[PDB]
Structure formats: C-alpha cells, structure tokens
Nucleic acid binder design. Structure first.
Ligand SMILES: [Mg+2]
Ligand SMILES: [Zn+2]
Ligand SMILES: [Zn+2]
Length: 1245
DNA sequence: GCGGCTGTCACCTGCTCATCGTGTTGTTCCCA
DNA sequence: TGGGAACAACACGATGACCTAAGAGGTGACAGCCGC
C-alpha cells in the first residue's frame, strides 16, 4: 500500500475490468425471484447468487469448486464474488463524461477552446461542428471553385435575364390585351399591380437565393475546425455544394475525433508564447487553459478518455434489491439509472439497424447522452430523474459527496462492535480512575471473555453451553463477569466530542442499576451534567489498545486542559461551596471560642463537637513537627536566639479551625493555606499540585478535596428559600424616582417638543441608570453569609446579573426585530412579572434558544475546517538548531514607570521556551531553551526587561515538519512535547471547543450597519478564512501626507507619499468617521478610517511577522473579550498553515508557471536549482490563504476528496494522474492503517 | 481589450399508495 | 387427463387530438457574457 493513483479510464481499461456485458434492462424475475441472463443482477457475468451453486442447477452440488458450468455459464465459487465482480456495456453512440465536460470551470476541459454554450449545443445534438478541413486543397481549388461560383452566379443572372425578358413580354401582353378588353375601369392598372407583384416576388426571391449562395460561399471560405453551424438547412446547403473538403458531425463523436486528431505539444507551445507576452484577461485565460493542457501533455493518460464508448456496471451487491414484506422490492436507484441507459442504448441500436432518419437517431443519441449524464450526476444539467416519489434519484457521484457520502459517513466514522451506552449518574464514592457500569451492559460488552473464563474455570464443558448459560443469566456468570472486568480499561465517551478530554479511559467496576456511574468532577471534561445526559462506552481488545488506554487516556492522567493548561478536573459547584464554607472568615457567622488557643487540631475538633467552638472562628492553633507553615507567615517566625527550623519545627498560628481541617486534605509537604479557598484559589492550588507533585498524589489530593467539599457542603446551611432571595428596599424608591423621570419625558414627548426616537433614547438611558443603581444596591443589601451569596462568591454557580434579575430588577430586554423596549421590566422574578412583561421577556429567550441551536452546527463546521487544515502538522523532530524566535512583551504596562507582568502572559508567553540566554546585568537570568514558567517571569519583570525571544513554530526551521522544542510544552501533559504529537488536531479542537459558548452578536440593531463588523464566531471564521472584513478600512501604503478630495458624487481620501513616491487614493463612503485628519503625516502601516484592516494589506505593506501578530491578536480579541482563554500556540499553528504558499511571478526562468501559489518550500528549492544551473531565479509575492483553500491544496487527493468538493477534487486528480502516498493522518484512516502520529510512528512500531 | 452582473458551483442543514386499447396464443395452472 | 380459466407474452395501431401541480433558504467564489 505504497500509493493510490487515479487517472482516466480508457475503453480498454473498462473492458479489462469486466467479465461480461449487460445487454438486458431486466433485474430479476418477479415470479421465481432469480437472476435473469445478460441483465442487471445477472449471474453469468457477476458471481453466483448462492454459495457453491450455478443458475441451471447441474452444479448446484457443493462438491464442485471453481469449474465453469456447461449450460448456463455460471462458475461455481463463493457468493461474495458479486461484491467484487464487474461488468460493462458497449455503447453504440459515444457520449461525454459529465464530470470532465459541463462541470466546474477549471476542469471544464479547455483542451478544445470552446465556450460552455458551444459545447452545450454540440454535445446535445443541437448544432454541428467541423472535425477536419482540407485547407491546402481548398486553397488549391479556390481558383476553380470561385470561377465555378462566378459561373453559377452568371447562370442565375442569365436565367434571371431570360425571365426578365419573359416578364417584359408578359407585362406588355397582359397590359395590352386587358386594356383592349376593358372589362373594368382599371384592368390595365390591376394587372399592372399583379405584374409588379410577380416582378417584385422574382426580384426578392432571386436576391434571397443569390444571397443564400453568397452566404454558403463565404461560409465555406471561412470554415475552420471548432466552428458550429446552428442552422441545419445552411449546413445541408454547404454539404451539397462544397462537400468533400470539410468533415462535420454532431454530439460526442465530433469531440472524440478532435481529441484523437488534436495534438497537445503545439497547443502548449502557443499557450506559452501568449502567456509570455499577454495583456489583461487574455493572459489569465491562457494560463488557465495551459494548466489543463500541460496536465494532459506531461502525463501518459490521453484525453480520449474524456469521451465514453463503454460504461462499467458496479457489482450487483453494491446496488442490491431485496424482498420487502408484502410482496414488494426495495432496490437501489443505480438499478433504475442503469435500466434507463440500457433501454436507450438498445433502442438506439435498433434505430441504427433500421436505418431510421437523422432526426430519430439524433433524438435517441441525445437521450442516451442525458441518461448517462443522470447515471453519473443526476443534478448537474436539466431536471433530476426522480425515483419512487418526487425526490431525486441517487447518482454514482452522489454516493461519494455530501455529508452522507461514502467518505464522510462510512470511512471516517463507523459504527463499532463491543460498544454500549446508557444514561449517566453521579457516583460520588468513586476514585478518579473508576467508573461504575450497569450489570447487563457489562455482561453484553464482555461476553466472549466471560465465555472463555466460564469454560476455563470448568463452569461449562463447551463454549456453546457457556453461551447458553450467559444468555440465561446465571449467577456464576455474574461472578465470572466480576472476575473478568478487572484490568480491562473502558473508554467512556459523550456524544459531542469537542476535544480529546471527551473520550477518557476508566477502570471498570461492576455495579447494579441501569445507569452508568461517573466521577463528579470529570463532568467538565465531558460537559456532562446529570439531567438525562447519556454516555457511550467502548472496550479495547488488543494488548496494545488497552495499554494505550491506561497509559495515555486514563482519567487520572488527564487533569489539565490542552487549550490553556489550567486544570479541568478540579472541584466545582457544591464541592467548592463546601471548601469555601470550610475556609471562609467569621463575618456574620456569630463565632464562639474566638481568641482561644489549642495545643492541636484534635482539641479544636473536641471543642467544635462540644458546641463551644466554631469551624470559622479565629483561634491560635499549634501545629506539630512536619507541618510546613504558610509562605507569607514564615518571615514572622518565632523570635529566639536559637535558629528555629521553620521548615521542620513545631509552630503556632492564629488560624481558624476550618482552615486547619482544609490543610489536612493537601499533602503533608504542602505549605499551609490561610485564606478563603473559594474557586480561584482552589484552581491555583490544584495547578500547583499538578505542576509540582506526581500524578498519583495529585489524584489522591483531588479525591480528598472532593470528599471534604461534599461533606462540608452538606452542613454549609445553603438552602434557597423565598426569604433568602432578598429584594433590596432600595429598589422601590429608585424605580419610583426613575419612573417619575420617565413620566416627565413621556409628557414632554406628548407635548410635542421631542421626537419619538429622542423619547426612546432618553428612556433607555434613564432605565439603564435605574437598572445599574438597583443592581449595586442589591449587591450591597445581602449579607455574605447568605445562601445565594455564598454559592456566587464561592465561584460555585451563579453571576450577579442573574441575582439582579431574581432579586432586584430584570431590566431592559431585546424587543422584537432586535430592538430595545423603552419601558423595562420593573420587577424581579420574586416580585412577579406581569402579563405584558412576561410576553416581552420571552422574545430574548426564544432568540437565544435558536441562536444556540444554530451556533452548535456553526462551531462544528469551523472545527472541521480547522482540523482539515492543521492535520498532519506532527512533531517529528526533537530539536532543530534554530536561534530565531518571537519578541514577545514579557513585562509591559509601565503605566507609572512600574514593571508589571503583562495581563496575558498566561496565553501568550507561558509555556514557550527561550531562544537564547537573557542577560541584563551581565549574568544569565534565564538559561537558553528552558521552560518559561512563572518564576522566570518574576525574575525578568523584577530586573526590568520588556521583551523576550521565544522559540516558536512560526520561526521553526526543521527538515521534518515541526519540532518539539520550538512548539514548547504540551499544555495538556505539562512536560515537554513528545515526538509524534498530533498538535494540529489539538489546536483545532482547542479553538473549536469554546465556539459554542462565544455568544457574541449585536443585542439590538441600534440603527447601525457596516460600522458594526461581524462579532463572535462570524468574526472568527472571517479571520480564519482570510475573507476581507465586512467593515473594511484601507491602510496606508507608505508614510505620506494624507488629505481629503471629497466629491459630492463620491467621497475620496487621497494620500501622496514623500520621498518622491506616486500618489494613492481610496474611495470612502460619506459615513466614514475618519480617524486620520487632513494634510496629516501617516506612516507605512497605519489605518485611515474606522474599520477592520484586511489581513492581506497587513501582509502586503507591513510584512509577515505583522500579519501573524495581527491575526493572532484579532482572534484573541474576541476570545478574551468573552473570557475564553486559548494559548497563542494553537492559533499560531493555523496561522503557520495559512502562510505556507507564495504566488509566483517572473517565473519563465525558474521553470514553473506564474501563479499557481507554488509552495514556499517549492519556490525556494527550484529557485536554488535554477540559480545553480546559472539562470536567475523567479520572484514571489507572499500569499495569505484561507482554511478551506489551504486544505483543498493538499498534495494528497484522498484528504482533499474526503474534506470537500469530491467531484472537483477527483476530476482534477484524474486529469493530473496524481498519485497519493500513504503519508498523512486522514488518508491513513481511510485505508485503515496506523496513523503517522502518537505511538503509530515507525520508531514506536 | 477591460469593467459590471449574472448566473452557476461549493458549504451549511433535517408510513399510504389511480389502469389500458383490443384481440389472440401458449403455458400453466384450477377444478373434476 | 378432460375442460375451464389466469398470467405472460405477443402483434397491431379503435374518424380524433397541448402539464401539473409544487414552489420564501442563505452566504461566498468566480468565470463567463454583455456592455462600454
Ligand atoms: Mg444535560
Ligand atoms: Zn449451470
Ligand atoms: Zn524548531
């Protein structure tokens, strides 16, 4: 399986595939339900329908093996051959392939220069076309032929003059004789009108026919190949008159003749000449056609494969028909399409045999063409061929593309064996690496192992008896299942897998019930809440599979998220509300025994049980040898002449009992903790534990924290009641006064001083003031010991706006058509919304529900594109010896001359290693290529630096893809990135996870358009696709003097640069809110009007580092405006993929074509080669691609076909005859092979 | 020869069932 | 096995002559065809 190539399928190739010809449009006999002969589903050409049988029955006996029968012609062998055996049908009239012609423009042929309409006319027998002209013989006989045409013109004139003499005689005779008769007053004038009618008729008819001959003559004079005679009468005239010099045809026969005669070398030569010297559109068209011409020229596959004379038939078992109950049949649409084409082919053969007129044979040939077109693609041209209902039929190419196609429904994602699912319930008694799975589910998944163990343990004498008893559900079966499930890791999974911590391996323990028991704090990795959610489950089988499961995927190991490195499996909700109650202060908690001193914590809990001490009362507790005091409290160590071993001596601390209990959950070596560990400090402590202590102890500490959090959450006293929702007394008076102001504004509106818009905006301002005032008063009112206050301030569940709506005020809401209701909801949910208030409030609820429903699929599509782009960027190198990096701001924000760590070092500079040693005082503060953790940050910010040079993938220069050292440390594992890490998929998943929760879009229209650039996920797709921003704003090309040349017809802003440069201008709208004044000094890389700068501009005028910085900053802008945190590396992966190609110009020397976005790598190597030969090298404009385009440009065509545009991709791959090498991730899961990543690398293989 | 605009190709998404136009031939049944 | 009758095949070609309803996507990317 070294490679897989596709080209054109000749007639000979199709004949070589086949074993027989399908001649009848018949599938099976409706009565006897058997294959017919030489039809669809036939048994002579395809394989036997029954294993080891033949049609007639002479060799129905199974003994025979591989022989051919002597009566029916069916060989005796297996019945699966019908899946593999193929046939063909010989067409009478050749037809064109609807892919290679009448398709996407770049693949529309262009080998024969013809417009789409001209080919539409030729192919579907509506216009003729010349396949050959004897120009040399035509010119040789042109003296003779023009003399002959002059002779015919003179004969026409001679008989015309004889008829003119006869007309004069007739006129004289009729005039004279009628005048002599005088039967009427105007006999002479009446017959003068008659004779003038005859004379005019002959004049006009003679002119018509001599002009007809002139048209035929000059048409023959100017007659070349690829010339269409739309009118058949004129073609008949030409064939009758000057035949034997030119040859014409209709339909695909003409195209076949041209593709056979036409040679490509000379065409490529002229195309190279014109592209070398071309202007405007003509050059672009020339190079576009040259692409296809060179594709056919370089390769051995001939263009004649683009016209078809034989059609292959897919094996019958891939298009089966089956008896449905009620005497019915369910059959594949392919059978109907094959029947249509065979019907029309046979009717055409009949018509040819009878020598039918041209019209009938032409109609039948056109119909056969349309039939094969529907067979290959039903929807490209005309109306589709519907099947049973009005719905369209399924074409052979419709079975490859689309969401439900073969690639995207059967080769990437498969239904699997040894799998189960069920609802998910919380087991709070589980260890981090444990899952409780129902009894029946465990029995079903582990069946074969259970039978093997039952037989081995002598509970059964044979495997079938073991199966019988397992089905019967005996007790010994259940004991054996308990024995066997041990040491078999089990992969739990949730439906939407937004990242790698969405499938996790657990150790299975056998449990009763009908639901799966899961750990309480792995609910954020899965996003699984217990509201009816379901969990799927899989069982690895091979030793390697389960070894990887336990080592890599085990839930105990997966504690840190890959998106930012913060721990994800940490306590939350009630657990944190319990540890917060444990370590909170004594405020409003009526302490007892405050100020007392205890000789141990055991004595403290004695006092607590006695009821004379509180868990949260300030008391002086002594801690024994081993306890490590707080880091902050150490410098206030006990005063004594002797040197006290603060690290390892008994000490005393004015702590609280709850904190002394909390610090027993953490490991003994951990320093004491003496502050409210609500939610954020717990995250910090868990991060420190993960980054400092080994994983087993971190899991044990997490378990202890879980147990303590639940235990103390039960006793916290947090219980929601209608009194615990405290409506502030402030709300009444505030809402009444602002209501009075609203009344005044309404009165001044109804009096006519203001407009309705002014009244609105005034009331929105008034009620925003009222809402915020009530919010702050509500925050002030409740104590900090309140239930809701406790769960919010502890960071368990809740925000302050939610509390505002519940307790104080709901406020203004999104009116219909995304507006702001002037009058707000002046009532919280506790007080009770009115009727109209509720009706108004449901608007935003509905809108948000619909928005979420759509945004799920939107983010899914975005993640699909990101994965397809970034896939195969795999760490293959331990260390490239580069010394380049990014100059990232290490400690900026010198507001009042104070060096402060930047506000986003966690996402940007953290985890990125160091290019080289940093020295500010003549000594190495940070050694080279060392993990850049917080300690180095404190050192460098203290010593005053404002930048740092970090290794990165963007600046990585390695022979084999990316290297571990430049990427940094894996944000998921903490340690250095391991070689073989599928970093691209990790980056794509990291950017895709928060996509659903962005929720950034305009709340109200606000009477603004264009200025409001797209917000949220639309913005992210806009940046990642390289699409020009909606609110585009030009960016100055060079430093210069900029002024306004506004014209009433069209406003303009014109900048002329200094340094003797050419002027530039930008057309701008009237509503521009210009951020640059007139006649001012702009610089090389500055904006002009308010908007969104194009990434293309920033790549063009500034450079490549500038576009990288701009894109990363612009995506992080929205991401960190939400609060989502993604490391900059995950964006940098996509940015690196987007800038890997260059558009080439001045390319005749470098031996390639201008354009074609040659790869940067390719451009460089071939310029090196041409310079080595001696010729100068070509030049390159850096190009910023999109994600769809950058993915579709893959060297491997399997991946491109799998992603999108299967028809176009496969057609181009066939034209180019380009093979696919196995290297890649996607294209190695299509073939079903070990991926070139993780432990599948040849090093580990 | 070079623009607009104007379509056309990509993507994103999901159990009932109505007749002719005549007349004849040969097999294959159904009854007895 | 006789007649009595059901389907699958066939061969011809009854003085008169035309659909049908269904049917609101949206957004990019682009290359033609038509206009200057
Ligand atoms: Mg749920
Ligand atoms: Zn046989
Ligand atoms: Zn590197």
């Amino acid at each position: 399986f070294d490679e897989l190539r596709i080209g054109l399928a000749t007639a000979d190739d199709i004949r070589q595939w086949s074993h027989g010809e399908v001649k009848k449009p018949e599938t099976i006999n409706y009565r006897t339900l058997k294959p017919e002969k030489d039809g669809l589903f036939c048994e002579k050409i395809f394989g036997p329908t029954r294993d080891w049988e033949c049609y007639c029955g002479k060799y129905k006996r199974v003994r025979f093996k591989g022989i051919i029968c002597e009566r029916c012609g069916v060989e005796v062998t297996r019945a699966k051959v019908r899946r593999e055996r193929m046939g063909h049908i010989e067409l009478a009239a050749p037809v064109t392939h609807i892919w290679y012609f009448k398709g996407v423009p770049s693949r529309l042929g262009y080998l024969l220069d013809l417009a789409p309409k001209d080919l539409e006319k030729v192919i579907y027998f509506a216009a003729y076309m010349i396949t050959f002209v004897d120009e040399e013989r035509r010119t040789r006989d042109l003296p003779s032929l023009e003399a002959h045409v002059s002779v015919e013109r003179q004969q026409i004139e001679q008989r015309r003059d004889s008829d003119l003499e006869a007309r004069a005689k007739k006129l004289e005779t009729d005039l004279a004789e009628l005048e002599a008769e005088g039967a009427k007053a105007d006999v002479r004038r009446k017959v003068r009108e008659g004779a003038e009618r005859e004379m005019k008729q002959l004049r006009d008819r003679a002119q018509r026919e001599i002009d007809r001959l002139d048209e035929v003559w000059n048409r023959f004079k100017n007659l070349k190949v690829q010339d269409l005679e739309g009118d058949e009468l004129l073609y008949r005239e030409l064939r009758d008159r000057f035949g034997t010099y030119f040859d014409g045809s209709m339909g695909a026969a003409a195209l076949q003749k041209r593709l056979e005669s036409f040679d490509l070398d000379e065409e490529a030569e002229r195309l190279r000449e014109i592209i070398r010297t071309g202007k405007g559109q003509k050059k672009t068209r020339a190079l576009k056609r040259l692409k296809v011409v060179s594709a056919f020229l370089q390769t051995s596959n001939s263009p004649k494969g683009m016209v078809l004379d034989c059609v292959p038939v897919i094996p019958p078992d891939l298009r089966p028909m089956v008896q449905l109950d009620g005497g019915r049949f369910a059959t594949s649409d392919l059978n109907d399409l094959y029947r249509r084409v065979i019907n029309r082919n046979n009717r055409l053969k009949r018509l040819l045999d009878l020598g039918a007129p041209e019209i009938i044979v032409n109609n039948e040939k056109r119909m056969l063409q349309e039939a094969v077109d529907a067979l290959f693609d039903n929807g490209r041209r005309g109306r589709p061929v519907t099947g049973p209902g009005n719905r369209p039929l399924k074409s052979l190419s419709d079975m490859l593309k689309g969401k439900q196609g073969r690639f995207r429904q059967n080769l990437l994602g498969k239904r699997v064996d040894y799998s189960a699912r069920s609802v998910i319930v919380v087991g709070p008694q589980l260890k981090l690496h444990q899952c409780g799975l129902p009894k029946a589910m465990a029995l079903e998944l582990f069946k074969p192992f259970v039978m093997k163990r039952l037989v081995d343990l002598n509970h059964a004498q044979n495997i079938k008896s073991a199966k019988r008893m397992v089905e019967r559900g005996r007790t010994v079966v259940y004991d054996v299942l308990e024995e066997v499930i041990a040491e078999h890791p089990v992969l739990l999974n949730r439906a939407p897998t937004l990242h790698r911590l969405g499938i996790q391996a657990f150790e299975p323990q056998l449990v009763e019930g009908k639901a799966i028991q899961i750990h309480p704090l792995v609910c954020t990795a899965f996003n699984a809440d217990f509201d009816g959610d379901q969990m799927a489950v899989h069982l690895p089988l091979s030793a390697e599979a389960q070894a990887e499961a336990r080592i890599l995927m085990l839930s105990s190991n997966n504690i840190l998220k890959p998106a930012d490195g913060r721990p994800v499996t940490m306590p939350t909700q009630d657990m944190v509300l319990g540890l917060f109650f444990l370590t909170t202060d004594s405020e409003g908690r009526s302490p007892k025994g405050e100020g007392r001193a205890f000789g141990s914590s055991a004595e403290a809990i004695m006092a607590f049980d006695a009821g004379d001490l509180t868990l949260q009362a300030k008391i002086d507790i002594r801690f024994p040898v081993g306890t490590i005091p707080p880091r902050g409290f150490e410098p206030p160590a006990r005063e004594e002449g002797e040197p006290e071993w603060q690290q390892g001596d008994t000490f005393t601390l004015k702590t609280t009992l709850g904190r002394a209990l909390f610090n027993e959950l953490l490991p003994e070596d951990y320093p004491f903790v003496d502050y409210e560990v609500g939610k954020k400090q717990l995250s910090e402590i868990v991060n420190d534990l993960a980054e400092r202590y080994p994983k087993v102890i971190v899991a044990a500490t997490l378990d202890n924290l879980k147990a303590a959090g639940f235990f103390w959450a039960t006793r916290s006293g947090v219980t929601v009641a209608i009194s615990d929702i405290v409506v502030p007394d402030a709300k009444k008076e505030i809402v009444k006064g602002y209501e009075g102001q609203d009344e005044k504004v309404q009165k001044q509106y109804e009096r006519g001083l203001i407009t309705k818009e002014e009244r609105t905006q005034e009331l929105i301002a008034i009620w925003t003031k009222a809402t915020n005032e009530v919010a702050e008063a509500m925050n002030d009112n409740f104590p900090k010991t309140n239930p809701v206050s406790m769960m919010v301030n502890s960071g368990a569940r809740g925000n302050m706006m939610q509390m505002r709506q519940i307790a104080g005020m709901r406020g203004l809401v999104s009116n219909a058509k995304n507006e702001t209701i002037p009058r707000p909801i002046k009532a919280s949910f506790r007080e009770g919304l009115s009727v109209l208030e509720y009706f108004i409030s449901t608007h935003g609820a509905r809108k948000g529900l619909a928005d979420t429903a759509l945004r799920t699929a939107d983010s899914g599509y975005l993640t699909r594109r990101l994965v397809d782009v970034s896939q195969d960027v795999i760490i293959r190198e331990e260390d490239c010896g580069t010394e380049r990096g990014l100059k990232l701001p290490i400690a900026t924000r010198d507001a009042d001359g104070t060096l402060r760590k930047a506000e986003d070092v966690e996402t940007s500079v953290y985890a990125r290693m160091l290019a080289e040693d940093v020295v500010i005082d003549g000594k190495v503060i940070a050694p080279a290529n060392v993990d850049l953790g917080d300690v180095l940050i404190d050192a460098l910010v203290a010593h005053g630096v404002e930048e740092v040079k970090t290794r990165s993938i963007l600046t990585c220069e390695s022979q084999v893809g990316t290297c571990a050292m430049c990427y940094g440390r894996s944000l998921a594992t903490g340690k250095l990135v391991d070689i073989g890490e599928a970093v691209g998929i990790i980056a794509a998943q990291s950017i895709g996870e928060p996509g659903t929760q962005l929720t950034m879009r305009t709340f109200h229209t606000g009477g603004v358009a264009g200025d409001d650039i797209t917000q949220g996920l639309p913005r992210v797709v806009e940046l990642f696709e390289a699409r020009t921003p909606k609110g585009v704003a030009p960016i100055s090309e060079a430093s210069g003097r900029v002024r306004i040349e506004e014209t009433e017809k069209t406003k303009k802003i014109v900048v002329t640069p200094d340094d003797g440069s050419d002027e530039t201008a930008f057309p701008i709208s009237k509503r521009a809110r210009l951020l640059v004044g007139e006649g001012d000094h702009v610089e090389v890389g500055q904006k002009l009007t308010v908007g969104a700068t194009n990434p293309h501009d920033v790549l063009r005028i500034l450079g490549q580092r500038a576009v990288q910085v701009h894109l990363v900053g612009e995506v992080q802008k929205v991401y960190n405006s939400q609060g989502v945190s993604i490391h900059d590396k995950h964006i940098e992966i996509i940015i690196r993929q987007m800038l890997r190609r260059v558009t080439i110009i001045e390319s005749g020397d470098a031996e390639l074509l201008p354009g074609e976005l040659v790869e940067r790598t390719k451009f460089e190597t071939e310029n090196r080669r041409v310079v080595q030969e001696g010729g100068h090298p070509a030049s390159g404009r850096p190009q910023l691609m999109g994600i769809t385009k950058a993915s579709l440009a893959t060297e491997s065509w399997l991946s491109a076909a799998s992603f999108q545009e299967t028809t176009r991709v496969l057609t181009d791959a066939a034209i180019n005859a380009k093979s696919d090498s196995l290297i890649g991730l996607k294209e190695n899961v299509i073939i079903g092979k070990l991926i070139p990543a993780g432990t599948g690398l040849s090093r580990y293989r």
